[PDB]
Design a protein around this ligand. Structure first.
Ligand SMILES: CCCCCCCCCCCCCCCCCC(=O)OC[C@H](CO[C@@H]1O[C@H](CO[C@H]2O[C@H](CO)[C@H](O)[C@H](O)[C@H]2O)[C@H](O)[C@H](O)[C@H]1O)OC(=O)CCCCCCCCCCCCCCCCC
Ligand code: CLA
Ligand code: CLA
Ligand SMILES: C=Cc1c(C)c2cc3nc(c4c5[nH]c(cc6nc(cc1[nH]2)C(C)=C6CC)c(C)c5C(=O)[C@@H]4C(=O)OC)[C@@H](CCC(=O)OC/C=C(\C)CCC[C@H](C)CCC[C@H](C)CCCC(C)C)[C@@H]3C
Ligand SMILES: CC(C)=CCC/C(C)=C/CC/C(C)=C\CC/C(C)=C/CC/C(C)=C/CC/C(C)=C/CC/C(C)=C/CC/C(C)=C\CC/C(C)=C/CC1=CC(=O)C(C)=C(C)C1=O
Ligand SMILES: CCCCCCCCCCCCCCCCCC(=O)OC[C@H](CO[C@@H]1O[C@H](CO)[C@H](O)[C@H](O)[C@H]1O)OC(=O)CCCCCCCCCCCCCCCCC
Ligand SMILES: CCCCCCCCCCCCCCCC(=O)OC[C@H](CO[C@@H]1O[C@H](CS(=O)(=O)O)[C@@H](O)[C@H](O)[C@H]1O)OC(=O)CCCCCCCCCCCCCCC
Ligand SMILES: CCCCCCCCCCCCCCCC(=O)OC[C@H](COP(=O)(O)OC[C@@H](O)CO)OC(=O)CCCCCCCCCCCCCCC
Ligand SMILES: CCCCCCCCCCCCCCCC(=O)OC[C@H](COP(=O)(O)OC[C@@H](O)CO)OC(=O)CCCCCCCCCCCCCCC
Ligand SMILES: CC1=C(/C=C/C(C)=C/C=C/C(C)=C/C=C/C=C(C)/C=C/C=C(C)/C=C/C2=C(C)CCCC2(C)C)C(C)(C)CCC1
Ligand SMILES: CCCCCCCCCCCCCCCCCC(=O)O
Ligand SMILES: CCCCCCCCCCCCCCCCCC(=O)O
Ligand SMILES: CCCCCCCCCCCCCCCCCC(=O)O
Ligand code: OEX
Ligand SMILES: [Cl-]
Ligand SMILES: [Cl-]
Ligand SMILES: [Fe+2]
Lengths: 34, 33, 34, 30, 36, 82, 36, 334, 37, 38, 65, 341, 32, 36, 30
C-alpha cells in the first residue's frame, strides 16, 4: 500500500546521496583489486 | 522421624568409598619418595 | 590508501542501519495515545 | 541416626580444616 | 582526515543520546504505558 | 597492530563522513518514525491497536486454542471487531 | 544472671582496652619500610 | 624486655602461623562465641516463636530438622529491635523460647567479620603490600550487614532478618519479593550482573590463562608442575592469549595490560555486589522495585496485562500466605 | 615375553587429598538429607 | 499424494538451498578476486 | 611379539595402517550421501513433529488399529 | 590450490572481525536471533498466545517487553514460517509465536557457531582450546532450559520467554511449582556462580595489591609491558598474606587459573542437570519424613513447611492468568489466604 | 524376614574398614 | 628437626591375601548373627 | 537384603581364591 513508499523514500534518498558522494573513491578501490 | 532406613548406608558408602580411594593413592605417593 | 567497503564496513552497517530506524520508530511511539 | 550422621560429617570437615591448615605441604620457593 | 575534532563529536553524540533516552522516560509518563 | 582498515577515529572526525551521515542517519530515523506514524507497523506484525484488543462488550482473551486451525481462529477473532 | 552480666562487661571492656591501647602503641611504626 | 611491648610484638608478629593483630584481638573471641553458639543451637535449640504469636518454629536437628530445613531462628517479633542478651531473660528457657541465640550470634559475627576486614587491612601493612583487598571484602560484608541488621532496623524487627539456615534463607527471599518486588529493582539487577559477570570473567580469565600455558611438561604429568612457587618468569603467554581473545571478538575489546585486566576482575563483581547490598539496605526503608501493575490499558480503559502483572499475581500469593496467622488488619505495613 | 612398557606410576599429592576429601564430605553433607528424605 | 505441508516442506527446502548456495557463490567469488599474495 | 594361529590369519586385516587415497578421493560422494541423510532426518523429524503431515500417516497411538 | 583452499585462504584472513569457516554458521544465526528479539520486543504482541502486551509499540518498557512463547496449543511445533500453522503468512506467524522458535533455534545454532569459532581461532593462533571447553557450560544451560525443559512439558509455552520481566516470572514459576530452591543441583549451581564471582573479585584484588613497583607513578597501570618476562605481582607475598589471613592459600598459579575455569563451569553444568529433571516434573519438592510428622502433629513447624505454604499461594494466585489456555476459575472462597491479607 | 536393619551397615563396615586398612598397607608397600 | 624413630611399614601380597580371607570369612560367619 | 549380603561375601571369597592362586607372589629360589 502507499505507506510502504512513504516509509521507504527516506531510505532510498539516503542511499542515493551516499552513492553519489562516495562513488569516485569506490571506483578507485574496485580498480585496485587487480 | 520416619526417614528412609537405607539413607544411612547410602551416606556411609557415599563418604567411605571415594575417600578410601583417595587415601590409598595419597599414601602410596608418599612411599615413592 | 585505505579501502572504504570492507567486511568491517558491512558488520558496522549491518547493525547501525536498523538501530537508527528502530530508534525512530520507538521515538514516534512516545506520542501514541490510547 | 540421621542427627548423628549430620553431625559426624560436619565434625570430619572441621577436623579436615585443622589438617589442611597446620599440616599442609609447606610452599617452598624456587 | 581529522578536521572535526573528536571532543566535539563526543559532546554532540552524547547530547543526542541524552535526548533520545529523555524522550523514552517522558513517554513512561505519557500516553501508552503510563497507567493513565 | 592493525589489519589495514581505516581507523574509526579517522573516519568520524572526517568531513566526508559527516557529509554522508548527516543525511543517512536522520533519513533512517524519519523512516522508522513513519513506519509507526502511518500505522504500517501495526499491520505488518498484527499488533492490536489500542481500540482492538477487545470488542466493545467482550472481556475474553481471543486465545489461540487450536494448532492447525490457529490461523483461522485469529481471523475469526479479528472479524469480531469489524 | 547479674554475675553473668558483670562477667561479660569485664571481658568486653578488657578486650576493647587491649584494642585501643594496642593501636595507640605506635602502630604506624610497625611496618617493614619507613618506621615513624 | 618490657611486658606490654613484648605482647604488642606478638599480637602484630608476622611470624605467627595465623596473623593475630589488633583487629584479631576483637575478632577471635567474637567469632568463637558466635560459632560455638551457632553450632549448639543448630543441633539442639528448642523451637523459637519467631513471629511473636506464640507459634514456635522448630529449627534444630534434634527437634526434627535436617541440614536443609534447619536454622537458628530469628528473635521474637515481640522483642522487635530491643536488645535481648541472656541476662535480660528470667532464665535460659525463656531466652531460648524467644530467640535469644540469634541476637548473640549475629551481633558477635557482624563484629567479628568487621574486624576480619580490618585484619585484612592490617596484615597488608605489616607485609608492605597495597591496602585495598579489604575494600574487596566490604562487598560481602555490606551484604551480611544488610540482611542481618539494616533490613531489621528499617522494618522494626529482628524477626524479619535472615534466618541462619538454608530453607530459612529461601523463606526470607520469597517474602522479600512479595513485600518489595526486589526482582524489578535495578540494584538487584546490578547484583545479578555483578555475580553472573563475575562467574563469566572468572571462567574467561581462567580459561585464557590455562589456554596459553607454556609447555613445560610431558603428557604424563600435570601441567601444574610446569610452574614452581616463586619463579620470576610468567608461566603463560599473555600476548598469545590477547591474540586469541582479540580475534574471538575484536582487538580493542581485549586486554593486554595485565594490571588493567585484574583490576577489571576485582571491580566488576565488587561493584555489582555493593549495589545489591545497597538494594537490600534501601528496600529496608521501603523504596521498592518498579511497579508497572496495570500500567498498560486499552482505548476503553481495560487493563492489558504484561509480564509485570503476572509477576504481581505471584507476589500476591506469597503475600497472602506468609505468616498466615500474624496479621489482623488489611495492610502488611512492615 | 617382555614386561609391559606402558605402565606408569600414579600420584595424588597431599593438597589433592585435602581438596578431594573436602569435596566428598561437603557432597555427603548436602545430599545426605535427600537420602534420608 | 502431495499434501499442503509436503508442499511447504519443499518450499522450505528450496529456500534453504537458495540461501545456502547464494551464500557460497558470493564467498567463492570474493575469495577468487581478493587472494593472499604468497 | 607373540605370533598365534588366529593372529596369522587376521594379520592382513591390520596391515594397511596409514594408507590413504590421494587428495580428496571420494569426499564429493560422501558429501552427497550426507546431504541425502539430512533431508531424510528432516522428514522423519518433521513427521514426528506434525510439521510434515502425510496422507495415511496418523502419528498417534491409534496407528495400532 | 583449488577453490576450497582459496576460500579457506579468504575466510581465515586476519581482519578487524575474523570470519572463519565457523563464521558461515555463526554470523547469520547470531544476527537473526538478535534481530528477532529486537524486532519482536519493539513491534510484536503476545495477545493471542498469552493475553499479554509485550512490545514497545503496545506501551511496554525495557523491563516488560518480551518475545513470548507460542500458545500451549502449538505443542512442540517447530513453527516454521512455511509450516502448516502459519502457512507462510508472516503476520500470523508473528501472532502465533513463531518468533520464539525462530530466536530459540537460530540462537542454538549461533551458540554452536560461536563455540566452533573458539575452536577455529584457538587452532590458528596455536593455543589450547580451554576457552571453548569452558563455554560448554553456557551451552548446557541454554539447551537444558530453553529446549530440554519445554520438550518434557506440554509445549513450548512453558519455556522461558525472552524478556526481562518474563524471565522473572520464570524464576517465580519454578519456586511455586518445582520448589527449585530446594534442589541440590540448583544449590551446586548457586555455589559455582557465587564461588565464581568470589574468585573473580579476590583474584583481581590480590593481584592489584601485591604489585611490584615497576614504575614511579601513582597510577600503577603504566608500569606493565605485555612482553615482559617477569611476573607483575608477588605470588610469594600473596601466598603469605592469605596463609596468615585465611589459613590456606594458592601456591600454584596454574592450579589457581584452572580452578577459576573449573568452579563456575561445573556449577552451571550441575544446574543444567536439575533442570533436565524438572522437564519431567522430577522435582526435589518434599521431604517425606517432614510431611509425615507435620500431617500427624499440628504443632510441628519448620521453614520447610512455611515455604510450601508460600508455594501453594504462588500456584493458586498466578495460575489462572499465567496458564490461560487452562480456563482456571478459582472462586474467591477457594484461594488460600492467611488471616486478613 | 524381620531381620535387624542395622545388620546391613554392621556387616558392610565390618568388611570394608579392615579390608581397606590392608589394601592401603599393601599398595604403599608395592610403590616403594 | 626430623624424628629418627620413624620406620616404613610393609604388607606383602601374601599377607594381604591372608588378611582379606580372614575378614571375609569372619563377615560370612558373623553376618547371620548381626541380622538375627 | 540379607540374601544379597551373604551371596556378595561368598562371591568376594571366590574372587580372592582366583587372585590368590593365579596372581600369587611367585615363589623363587634365592
Ligand atoms: C547439546 C548439543 C546442542 C545441539 C542442538 C542443536 C539444536 C537441535 C535442534 C533440535 C530440534 C528438536 C525439536 C524436536 C521437537 C520435538 O521433540 O517435538 C516433540 C514431538 C512429539 O510431539 C509431541 O507429542 C506429544 C505426544 O503425542 C502422542 O500422544 C498423544 C497422547 O495420547 C496423542 O496420541 C498424539 O497423537 C501422539 O502423537 C503431544 O502430542 C505434544 O503436543 C507433541 O508436541 O516429537 C518429535 O518431534 C521428535 C521426538 C523424537 C526425537 C527425539 C529427539 C530428541 C529431542 C528431545 C530430546 C529431549 C528429550 C525430552 C525428554 C526430556
Ligand atoms: C547458516 C545459516 C542458517 C541456518 C543454520 C538457519 C537455520 C534455520 N532457519 Mg534460518 N535463515 C537464514 C540462515 C540460516 N537459518 C537466513 C540467511 C535467513 C534470511 C533469508 C533465514 C531466514 C529464516 C526464516 C524466515 C525462517 C528460518 C528458519 C530456520 C529453521 C528451519 C530451516 C529449515 O527447515 O531449512 C530447510 C532447508 C534446509 C535444511 C536446507 C537443506 C538443503 C540441502 C543441503 C540440499 C537439498 C537439495 C536441494 C533442495 C535441491 C534443489 C531442488 C530444486 C532444483 C527443485 C532453522 C533453525 C525457520 C524458523 O526459524 O522456524 C521457526 C523460519 O521460519 N530461517
Ligand atoms: C543467590 C541467588 C542465586 C544464584 C546465584 C543463582 C544462580 C543460578 N540460577 Mg537460580 N534462582 C534463584 C537464586 C539464585 N540462582 C532463586 C531464588 C530462584 C527461584 C526458584 C531461581 C530460579 C532459577 C531458574 C528458574 C533457573 C535458575 C538458573 C540459574 C543458573 C543460571 C546460569 C546462567 O548464568 O544462565 C544465563 C544463561 C546462559 C548462561 C545461557 C546462554 C547465554 C548466551 C551465551 C547469551 C548470549 C547473549 C548474546 C551475546 C546477546 C546478548 C544481547 C542482549 C542482552 C541485548 C545459576 C546456577 C537457571 C538454571 O539452573 O539453568 C540451568 C534456571 O533456569 N535459577
Ligand atoms: C545472563 C548471563 C550471561 C550472559 C548474558 C552471557 C553472555 C556471553 N557469554 C559469552 C561468553 C562466555 N560465557 C562464559 C561463561 C559464562 N557465561 C555465563 C553467563 C552469561 N553469559 C556464566 C554464568 C558463565 C560462567 C560459566 C565463557 C567462558 C564465555 C566465552 O568465552 C564467551 C565470551 O566471549 O565472553 C566474552 C559471550 C558469548 C557471545 C556469543 O555467543 O555471541 C554470539 C551471539 C549469539 C550466538 C546469539 C545467542 C542468542 C541467545 C542464545 C538467544 C537470544 C537472546 C536474545 C537476543 C536476548 C534475550 C534477552 C532477554 C532474555 C532479557 C556473551 C557475551
Ligand atoms: C531479507 C534479508 C535477506 C534480510 C537480511 C538478513 C541477513 C542476510 C543476515 C546476514 C547478515 C550477515 C551475513 C552477517 C553480518 C551480521 C553481523 C555482523 C552479526 C552481528 C552478530 C553479533 C550479534 C555479535 C554478538 C556481539 C557480542 C556478544 C559481543 C559482545 C562483546 C563483549 C561483551 C565482550 C566482553 C569483553 C569485556 C568487556 C571484558 C573482557 C572479558 C574478560 C575480562 C576476559 C579476560 C581476559 C581477557 C584478555 O583479553 C586476556 C588477554 C586475558 C589474559 C584475560 O584473562
Ligand atoms: C554499530 C551499531 C551497534 C548497534 C547496537 C545494537 C545492540 C543492541 C542494543 C540493545 C539494547 C536494548 C535496549 C532497548 C531499549 C529501548 O529501546 O527501550 C525503549 C523504551 C521505550 O519506552 C517505552 O516506550 C513505549 C512506547 O509506547 C511507552 O511510552 C513506554 O512507557 C516507554 O517505557 O525505553 C525504555 O524502556 C526506557 C529507556 C531506558 C531503558 C534503557 C534500557 C537499556 C539499559 C538496560 C541495560 C542494557 C541491556 C543490554 C545489556 C544487557
Ligand atoms: C535472501 C538471501 C540473503 C543472504 C544471501 C547471502 C549473502 C551473503 C553475503 C555475505 C558477503 C559479505 C562480504 C562483504 C565483503 C565486502 O563487501 O568487501 C569485499 C572487499 C572489497 O574491499 C577490499 O577489502 C579487503 C578487506 S576485507 O576482506 O573486507 O577484510 C581488502 O583486502 C581489499 O584490498 C579491499 O579492496
Ligand atoms: C569496560 C569493558 C571494556 C574495557 C575496555 C577495553 C580494553 C581497551 C582496548 C585496549 C587497547 C586500546 C586502548 C584504547 C583504544 C580503543 O579501545 O579504541 C576503540 C577502537 C579505536 O580503534 P580505531 O580502529 O578507531 O583506531 C585504532 C586506535 O586504537 C588508535 O587511536 O574503536 C573501536 O574498537 C570501535 C568499536 C566499534 C566496533 C564495531 C565492531 C563491529 C561489531 C561486529 C560484531 C562483533 C564481532 C562478533 C564477535 C563474535
Ligand atoms: C581466622 C581463621 C580463618 C578461618 C580458617 C577456616 C579454614 C577454612 C579453609 C578451608 C580449609 C580446607 C581447604 C581444603 C583443601 C586445601 O588445602 O587446598 C589448599 C590449596 C592449595 O593450593 P596450591 O595452589 O597449593 O595447590 C596447587 C597444586 O598442589 C595442585 O595439586 O588451595 C586451594 O586449592 C584453595 C582453593 C580451594 C579453597 C576451598 C575453600 C572452601 C572452604 C569452604 C568449605 C566450606 C564447607 C563447610 C561446610 C560445613
Ligand atoms: C526477525 C526477522 C528477520 C530479521 C530481522 C532483523 C535481522 C532485524 C534487525 C533489527 C535490528 C538490528 C534492530 C536494532 C535495534 C536497536 C535498538 C533499538 C537499539 C537501541 C539501544 C539503545 C536504546 C541504547 C541506549 C543506551 C542506553 C539506554 C544507556 C546506555 C548507553 C546507550 C546510549 C547505548 C528477517 C528479515 C530475516 C525475516 C524474519 C523475521
Ligand atoms: C576408613 C579406612 C580406615 C583405614 C585408614 C588407615 C590409614 C593408616 C595407614 C597409614 C600408613 C602410612 C605409612 C606411611 C607411608 C609414607 C612413607 C613413610
Ligand atoms: C534525562 C532526561 C530526563 C527527562 C525526564 C522526563 C520526566 C517526565 C515527567 C513528565 O513530563 O511528566
Ligand atoms: C540451513 C539454512 C536454511 C535457510 C532457511 C531460510 C528460509 C528462507 C525463508 C523462506 C520463507 C518463505 C515461506 C513463505 C511461503 C510459504 C507458503 C506456503 O506454505 O506454501
Ligand atoms: O514478619 Mn516477617 O514479614 Ca515483614 O511484613 Mn509484615 O512483617 Mn511479617 O509480615 Mn510481611
Ligand atoms: Cl512465612
Ligand atoms: Cl496486623
Ligand atoms: Fe590472573
Amino acid at each position: 500500500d502507499w505507506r510502504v513508499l512513504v516509509v521507504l523514500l527516506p531510505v532510498l534518498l539516503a542511499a542515493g546521496w551516499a552513492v553519489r558522494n562516495i562513488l569516485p573513491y569506490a571506483v578507485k578501490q574496485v580498480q585496485k583489486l587487480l | 522421624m520416619e526417614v528412609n532406613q537405607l539413607g544411612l548406608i547410602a551416606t556411609a558408602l557415599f563418604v567411605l568409598v571415594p575417600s578410601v580411594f583417595l587415601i590409598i593413592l595419597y599414601v602410596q605417593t608418599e612411599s615413592q619418595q | 590508501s585505505y579501502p572504504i567497503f570492507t567486511v568491517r564496513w558491512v558488520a558496522v552497517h549491518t547493525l547501525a542501519v536498523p538501530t537508527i530506524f528502530f530508534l525512530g520508530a520507538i521515538a514516534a511511539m512516545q506520542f501514541i495515545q490510547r | 541416626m540421621e542427627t548423628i550422621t549430620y553431625v559426624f560429617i560436619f565434625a570430619c570437615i572441621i577436623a579436615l580444616f585443622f589438617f589442611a591448615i597446620f599440616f599442609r605441604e609447606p610452599p617452598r620457593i624456587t | 582526515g581529522g578536521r572535526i575534532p573528536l571532543w566535539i563529536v563526543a559532546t554532540v553524540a552524547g547530547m543526542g543520546v541524552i535526548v533520545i533516552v529523555g524522550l523514552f522516560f517522558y513517554g513512561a509518563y505519557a500516553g501508552l504505558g503510563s497507567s493513565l | 597492530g592493525t589489519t589495514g582498515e581505516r581507523p574509526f577515529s579517522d573516519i568520524i572526525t572526517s568531513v566526508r563522513y559527516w557529509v554522508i551521515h548527516s543525511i543517512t542517519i536522520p533519513a533512517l530515523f524519519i523512516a522508522g518514525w513513519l513506519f509507526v506514524s502511518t500505522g504500517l507497523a501495526y499491520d505488518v506484525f498484527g499488533t492490536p491497536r489500542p481500540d482492538s484488543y477487545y470488542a466493545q462488550e467482550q472481556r475474553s482473551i481471543p486465545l489461540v486454542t487450536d494448532r492447525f486451525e490457529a490461523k483461522q481462529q485469529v481471523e475469526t477473532f479479528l472479524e469480531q471487531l469489524k | 544472671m547479674e554475675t553473668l552480666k558483670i562477667t561479660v562487661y569485664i571481658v568486653v571492656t578488657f578486650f576493647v582496652l587491649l584494642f585501643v591501647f594496642g593501636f595507640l602503641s605506635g602502630d604506624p611504626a610497625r611496618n617493614p619500610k619507613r618506621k615513624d | 624486655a618490657n611486658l606490654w611491648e613484648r605482647f604488642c610484638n606478638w599480637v602484630t608478629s608476622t611470624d605467627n602461623r595465623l596473623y593475630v593483630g589488633w583487629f584479631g584481638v576483637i575478632m577471635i573471641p567474637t567469632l568463637l562465641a558466635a560459632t560455638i553458639c551457632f553450632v549448639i543451637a543448630f543441633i539442639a535449640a528448642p523451637p523459637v516463636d519467631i513471629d511473636g504469636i506464640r507459634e514456635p518454629v522448630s529449627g534444630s536437628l534434634l527437634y526434627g530438622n535436617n541440614i536443609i530445613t534447619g536454622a537458628v531462628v530469628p528473635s521474637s517479633n515481640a522483642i522487635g529491635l530491643h536488645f535481648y542478651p541472656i541476662w535480660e531473660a528470667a532464665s535460659l528457657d525463656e531466652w531460648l523460647y524467644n530467640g535469644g541465640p540469634y541476637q548473640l550470634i549475629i551481633f558477635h559475627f557482624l563484629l567479628g567479620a568487621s574486624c576480619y576486614m580490618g585484619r585484612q587491612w592490617e596484615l597488608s601493612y605489616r607485609l608492605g603490600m597495597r591496602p585495598w583487598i579489604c575494600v574487596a571484602y566490604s562487598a560481602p560484608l555490606a551484604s551480611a550487614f544488610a540482611v542481618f541488621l539494616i533490613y531489621p532496623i528499617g522494618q522494626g524487627s529482628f524477626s524479619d532478618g535472615m534466618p541462619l539456615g538454608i530453607s530459612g534463607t529461601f523463606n526470607f527471599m520469597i517474602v522479600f519479593q512479595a513485600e518489595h518486588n526486589i526482582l524489578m529493582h535495578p540494584f538487584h539487577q546490578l547484583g545479578v550482573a555483578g555475580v553472573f559477570g563475575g562467574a563469566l570473567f572468572c571462567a574467561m580469565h581462567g580459561s585464557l590463562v590455562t589456554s596459553s600455558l607454556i609447555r613445560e611438561t610431558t603428557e604424563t604429568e600435570s601441567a601444574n608442575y610446569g610452574y614452581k612457587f616463586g619463579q620470576e618468569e610468567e608461566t603463560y603467554n599473555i600476548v598469545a592469549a590477547h591474540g586469541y581473545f582479540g580475534r574471538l571478538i575484536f582487538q580493542y575489546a581485549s586486554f593486554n595490560n595485565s594490571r588493567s585486566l585484574h583490576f577489571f576482575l576485582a571491580a566488576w563483581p565488587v561493584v555489582g555486589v555493593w549495589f545489591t547490598a545497597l538494594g537490600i539496605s534501601t528496600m529496608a526503608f521501603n523504596l521498592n522495585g518498579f511497579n508497572f501493575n496495570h500500567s498498560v490499558i486499552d482505548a476503553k480503559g481495560n487493563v492489558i496485562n504484561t509480564w509485570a502483572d503476572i509477576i504481581n499475581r505471584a507476589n500476591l500469593g506469597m503475600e497472602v500466605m506468609h505468616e498466615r496467622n500474624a496479621h489482623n488488619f488489611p495492610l502488611d505495613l512492615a | 615375553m617382555e614386561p609391559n612398557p606402558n605402565r606408569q606410576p600414579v600420584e595424588l599429592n597431599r593438597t589433592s587429598l585435602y581438596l578431594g576429601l573436602l569435596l566428598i564430605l561437603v557432597l555427603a553433607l548436602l545430599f545426605s538429607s535427600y537420602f534420608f528424605n | 499424494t502431495i499434501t499442503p505441508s509436503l508442499k511447504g516442506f519443499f518450499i522450505g527446502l528450496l529456500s534453504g538451498a537458495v540461501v545456502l548456495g547464494l551464500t557460497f557463490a558470493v564467498l567463492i567469488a570474493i575469495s577468487q578476486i581478493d587472494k593472499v599474495q604468497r | 611379539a607373540r605370533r598365534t594361529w588366529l593372529g596369522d590369519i587376521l594379520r592382513p586385516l591390520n596391515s594397511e595402517y596409514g594408507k590413504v587415497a590421494p587428495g580428496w578421493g571420494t569426499t564429493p560422494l560422501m558429501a552427497v550421501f550426507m546431504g541425502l541423510f539430512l533431508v531424510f532426518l528432516l522428514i522423519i523429524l518433521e513427521i514426528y513433529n506434525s510439521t510434515l503431515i502425510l496422507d495415511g500417516v496418523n502419528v498417534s497411538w491409534k496407528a495400532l488399529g | 590450490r583449488g577453490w576450497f583452499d582459496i576460500l579457506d585462504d579468504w575466510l581465515k584472513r586476519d581482519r578487524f572481525v575474523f570470519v572463519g569457516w565457523s563464521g558461515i554458521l555463526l554470523f547469520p544465526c547470531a544476527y537473526l536471533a538478535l534481530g528477532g528479539w529486537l524486532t519482536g520486543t519493539t513491534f510484536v504482541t503476545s495477545w493471542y498466545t498469552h493475553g499479554l502486551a509485550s512490545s514497545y509499540l503496545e506501551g511496554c518498557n525495557f523491563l516488560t517487553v518480551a518475545v513470548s512463547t507460542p500458545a500451549n496449543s502449538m505443542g512442540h511445533s517447530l513453527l516454521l514460517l512455511w509450516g502448516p500453522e502459519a502457512q507462510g503468512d508472516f503476520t500470523r506467524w508473528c501472532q502465533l509465536g513463531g518468533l520464539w522458535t525462530f530466536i530459540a533455534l537460530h540462537g542454538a545454532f549461533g551458540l554452536i557457531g560461536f563455540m566452533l569459532r573458539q575452536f577455529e581461532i584457538a587452532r590458528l593462533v596455536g593455543v589450547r582450546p580451554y576457552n571453548a571447553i569452558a563455554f560448554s557450560a553456557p551451552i548446557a544451560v541454554f539447551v537444558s532450559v530453553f529446549l530440554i525443559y519445554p520438550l518434557g512439558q506440554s509445549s513450548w509455552f512453558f519455556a522461558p520467554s525472552f524478556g526481562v520481566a518474563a524471565i522473572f516470572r520464570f524464576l517465580l514459576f519454578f519456586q511455586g511449582f518445582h520448589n527449585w530452591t530446594l534442589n541440590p543441583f540448583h544449590m551446586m549451581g548457586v555455589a559455582g556462580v557465587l564461588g565464581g564471582a568470589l574468585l573473580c573479585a579476590i583474584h583481581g584484588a590480590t593481584v592489584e595489591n601485591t604489585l611490584f613497583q615497576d614504575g614511579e607513578g601513582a597510577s600503577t597501570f603504566r608500569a606493565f609491558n605485555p612482553t615482559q618476562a617477569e611476573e607483575t605481582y608477588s605470588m610469594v607475598t600473596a601466598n603469605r598474606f592469605w596463609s596468615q589471613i585465611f589459613g590456606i592459600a594458592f601456591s600454584n598459579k596454574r592450579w589457581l587459573h584452572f580452578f577459576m575455569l573449573f568452579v563456575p563451569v561445573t556449577g552451571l553444568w550441575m544446574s543444567a542437570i536439575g533442570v533436565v529433571g524438572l522437564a519431567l516434573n522430577l522435582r526435589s519438592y518434599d521431604f517425606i519424613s517432614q510431611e509425615i510428622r507435620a500431617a500427624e502433629d499440628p504443632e510441628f513447624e519448620t521453614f520447610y513447611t512455611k515455604n510450601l505454604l508460600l508455594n501453594e499461594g504462588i500456584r493458586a494466585w498466578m495460575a489462572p492468568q499465567d496458564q490461560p489456555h487452562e480456563n482456571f476459575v478459582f472462586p474467591e472462597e477457594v484461594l488460600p489466604r492467611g488471616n486478613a491479607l
